[PDB]
Every structure is written in C-alpha cells, then in structure tokens.
C-alpha cells in the first residue's frame, strides 16, 4: 500500500522530465507535496502547478520546463543537527554551489539555504537540482 | 493564414487532392499520427485532413526554400510509385536524387561513390526508405516525409500525411511540393496555377 505520497509525486515528476514530458498529473497530493512543489517553483526547477479538487485527496498538474536533472525524496525523514546539514548537501548535491536539500523544520518546510539563514534545523524531506 | 492570405486553401487544390484520393487514410492509425486524422469512414478507413495535409506541405515547401544550394536537398524514393515522381522534382527545383536501392554508407562513409552531404532529406515512404532515414540520423540532417496514417515517425521532422498506398496520391504531393517551392524563393510568381500537368509526376510501368 502507501507509506508515503511525496515519494510518488517526486518519482512521477522525474519520469515525466526523463521522457521529455512538459506536464504531469500527480495523485494524490498533500500539504507537504504542495510545500515541496512550491520550494521547487520558487527556484525555477518547475513551472506553474495546479491543484485540482476531486472530492477526495487532490490531484496536481505540474508544468515543467527542463532545468530539472533530479528531484529525490529521502526516507526515512532523518533528524539533522545543523552540522549534519553540511554532511547531507555534500552527500547528495552536484556542486557545493547549487542544488538544494529541502528539509522540514519547526519553522517551515524549507531549502537548506533558507535553513542556514534562519538558523533552524530539523528532519530531511528530499532534494533537487 | 499566417503568411498572410492567398496562401490559404484554394478550392482548385482541394479538388486535385480529393481527385488524387490523398486524404483516404490507413485503417491502422498509429499513435503519433492521430492528429492528422479527420474522421473514420464506416467500413473501416480513415479520412485524412486535407487542410492539415495542405498546410504542412506548404511548411515543407518553405523548408526546402531556405536551403541555399538547391542541389543539396535530396529527394528520395525506393518505392516505384515515387520514382518518376522524385526524378521530376529534382529536374525542376535544384534537388539531387536518390532512387531505388539507397545504398548503405551514402551519408556516413566519405569513400563511397554515392556519398552525399544533404542539408535536407525528403523521403516518400519512411518504412521502405528506412535506411536513408536511419543514415540521416547519423549525421544531423533534417527530414521531410511522406507519411500515411501508419508510418514510422522516428527520425522524421515534418510529415505530410498522404495515402501512399499509392496511385496519384504520391504523384500529386511531390508535384505540389515542387509547385510550391518554385513559387516561394524560385520564380513562378503569382501563387497562380500550372503549365505543367501533374501526370508528369506519376508512376510508369510495364508493358505487355
């Protein structure tokens, strides 16, 4: 069955972009999916998206450009300690310079750069570049 | 429209097309061709969109102009129904030829005696002419093509839906292309009609 819903949305995306696709319909969506789709959006890795309202759990249409090499999800959502964030981005990001680790902290779902600036930390959601 | 008016449909042409039985289309659609399809006739057969067949043909024509050296557009057919057809196209527009057994190593392979470096290939059956369509994709050359409803779309950018089951459908479409290209960047002038009878394109064949 389902343990997580994010992992499906992310994968669906990745296969869309790999095909050469410019849109996807993910299902079923969640506040966390929105928040993650949103961080991606702010940065350029996707275009605009749209939450369609079935009387159920939702369905999202993402319009994607093609700046996206990969958006992954980290499971389980490990706790990170401010100097485990430095260790994570190195593990899974292309160059020190770019790509984001996106985690969930007490003060919001955020990319790790925003994390560093706020100076808060938490549990790791996923990534992209 | 687009480029602005006259260039639209002309009953005169929609008449030659319907006459030549182009739009008739294959019973097996194929997925990448679904757009061309107007409607499915009862007793299985599909009606191609001549309007669409038209406009793409013009789009093709335009891409053939813009190649500066007309010789280096290669019109190609191993199919019989398209052999006199392409020979004629090459006579009018610059356009060098490749009929019959394409001969493998013609695009890749300097050494060979049919070595050609076209800047544009136009093919008549993507299934029969698969070799040229493959070789072309080994060396960055764009492709116009003859496609019925169930033809390979791989490595062909620009299709002009036809009928290619045959008759004059293959004749007319090569005719109209040459007619179109001579109009554009040529010198027919006055996207007015033909001193050339389209039959001149069209397959020959046998003798008793």
């Amino acid at each position: 069955v389902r343990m997580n819903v994010l992992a499906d949305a992310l994968k669906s995306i990745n296969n869309a972009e790999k095909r050469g696709k410019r849109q996807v319909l993910i299902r079923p969506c969640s506040k966390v999916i929105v928040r993650f789709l949103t961080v991606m959006m702010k940065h350029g890795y996707i275009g605009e998206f749209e939450i369609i309202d079935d009387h159920r759990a939702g369905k999202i249409v993402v319009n994607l450009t093609g700046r996206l090499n990969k958006c992954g999800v980290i499971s389980p959502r490990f706790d990170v300690q401010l100097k485990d964030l430095e260790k994570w981005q190195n593990n899974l990001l292309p160059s020190r310079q770019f790509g984001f680790i996106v985690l969930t902290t007490s003060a919001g779902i955020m990319d790790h750069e925003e994390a560093r600036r706020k100076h808060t930390g938490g549990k790791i959601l996923g990534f992209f570049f | 429209s687009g480029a602005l008016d006259v260039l639209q449909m002309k009953e005169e042409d929609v008449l030659k097309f319907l006459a030549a039985g182009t739009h008739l289309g294959g019973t097996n659609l194929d997925f990448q061709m679904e757009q061309y399809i107007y409607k499915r006739k009862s007793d299985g057969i599909y009606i191609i969109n001549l309007k669409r067949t038209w406009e793409k043909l013009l789009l093709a024509a335009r891409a053939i102009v813009a190649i500066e050296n007309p010789a280096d557009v290669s019109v190609i057919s191993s199919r019989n129904t398209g052999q006199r057809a392409v020979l004629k196209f090459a006579a009018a527009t610059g356009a060098t030829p490749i009929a019959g057994r394409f001969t493998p190593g013609t695009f890749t392979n300097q050494i060979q005696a049919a070595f050609r470096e076209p800047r544009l290939l136009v093919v008549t059956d993507p299934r029969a002419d698969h070799q040229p369509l493959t070789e072309a994709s080994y060396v960055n050359l764009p492709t116009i093509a003859l496609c019925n409803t169930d033809s390979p779309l791989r490595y062909v950018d620009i299709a002009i839906p036809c009928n290619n089951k045959g008759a004059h459908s293959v004749g007319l479409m090569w005719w109209m292309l040459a007619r179109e290209v001579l109009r554009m960047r040529g010198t027919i002038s006055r996207e007015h009609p033909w001193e050339v009878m389209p039959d001149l394109y069209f397959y020959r064949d046998p003798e008793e």
Binding site: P94, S95, R96, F98 | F115, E117, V139, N140
Partner: protein
C-alpha cells in the same frame, strides 16, 4: 622541423572550411554537433600541440581452421591539457599500426570537457562544475569536484586521461571490475564527456545560437569539383 608536409585533401565540407581558415576552433563543430570523419580536421584545429599517450598493448586471439591466430591491441588517449581529450582502442597485425590507427581513432572521438570551480571561482576553473559518472560494461567511474591542491585522485591510468583532459583537481570513486583497463578508461571517458551534458543554472538561458558555418560557408564548402 622539415619533413615535407603531406597533401591532405578533404573529403568533407567541414574540412574545407577548416583548411581555408574558415573554421578556426573545434568549438564551432562542437556547438553545431557536426560529425567529424576526417582526422586531419582534428589535427589542424587542435592536436597541433596535442600529445598522445599509449595506455596499453595487451594481445588477444581467435581460432583458425588449421589451428591459431594472435594480434596486438593498443589503447591510446589524446588531449591537449586544456579541455580536449579523446580515447581510441585498436587491434591490428602490427604494434606500429595498432598505435598509429589508435591515435587516429582517438582524435576522431575528441570530446569537450567542462571544467569548473569547487566553489569559489577565482582564477579559473580548477576542477569540475558538478559530479559526473560513466559506466562501461560493469565498470563505473565517478568524478567529484575537489578543492585546490587535491589533484587527480584516481588510478594511474585514469589520472593520465584526466590529466590530458586538463582537470587539475578531482575526486574519484570506481566500482566494478576496475582491472579490465579498456572498460575503466572508457567509463571515465564517458564520465568526463558527460560534463557538457549537465545543465546547470548558469546554462538556463537560450539563444539565437548560430547559423552553422556549413550554411554560411556553403559555397565555400562546395569547391569547384564534383
């Protein structure tokens, strides 16, 4: 030097532009993705002052009617020191030919490398923009950007290829049967070549681009023959 230059004559329009001093850098070819079939083209545009190192010799064989056969296989790598490299394997009757052909093969294959900054981009790129990996029949090489002074941390054979490519500093990790040298070098070759394929945010924006020297030079590249 004086030995009497040959008389290259070109099969290919791309070649004519090159000899004519119409095409001056490989970049034109690379941007256009023109295929290169005449080795001299590579030779004229670069390669001049590009050094070729022979990586391996190992012999093989297959069975005849009346028993055996055996022959020499040479692995050659070519590259300046900056940003260009190629790799060629050949097997031939004689070592000299095997090497001579291998070099030709390597040159045809010459590939772009995108070299980048570990992070603070001062005084020009020392390493790689991102991390790129390549696989060849179960060997896989991963290149990782590294800080200055790190150098090429790779096996000797790989270090040699990366060196010619013109990479200063890079971390590597290799998995698979590293022993089978032809495979390992091939994967690393794929790895480096992949750098151009990476799209970074720097690259995000587009472009009238180019008309292609083939088109502009078109007359030029139909001489007076046939």
């Amino acid at each position: 030097g004086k030995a009497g230059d040959k008389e290259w004559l070109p099969v290919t329009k791309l070649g004519r532009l090159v000899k004519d001093m119409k095409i001056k850098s490989l970049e034109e070819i690379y941007l256009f993705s023109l295929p290169i079939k005449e080795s001299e083209i590579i030779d004229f545009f670069l390669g001049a002052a590009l050094k070729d190192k022979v990586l391996k010799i190992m012999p093989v064989q297959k069975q005849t009617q009346a028993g055996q056969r055996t022959r020499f296989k040479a692995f050659v790598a070519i590259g300046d020191y900056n940003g260009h490299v190629g790799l060629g394997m050949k097997c031939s009757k004689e070592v000299a030919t095997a090497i001579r052909g291998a070099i030709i093969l390597a040159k045809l294959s010459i590939v772009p490398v995108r070299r980048g900054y570990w992070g603070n981009k001062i005084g020009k790129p020392h390493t790689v923009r991102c991390k790129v990996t390549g696989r060849c029949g179960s060997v896989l090489v991963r290149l990782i950007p590294a800080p200055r002074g790190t150098g090429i941390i790779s096996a000797p054979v790989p270090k040699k290829l990366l060196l010619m490519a013109g990479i200063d500093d890079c971390y590597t990790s290799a998995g698979g049967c590293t022993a089978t040298l032809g495979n390992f070098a091939k994967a690393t070759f794929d790895a480096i070549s992949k750098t151009y394929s990476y799209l970074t945010p720097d690259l995000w924006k587009e472009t009238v681009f180019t008309k292609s020297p083939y088109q502009e030079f078109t007359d030029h590249l139909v001489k007076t023959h046939t």
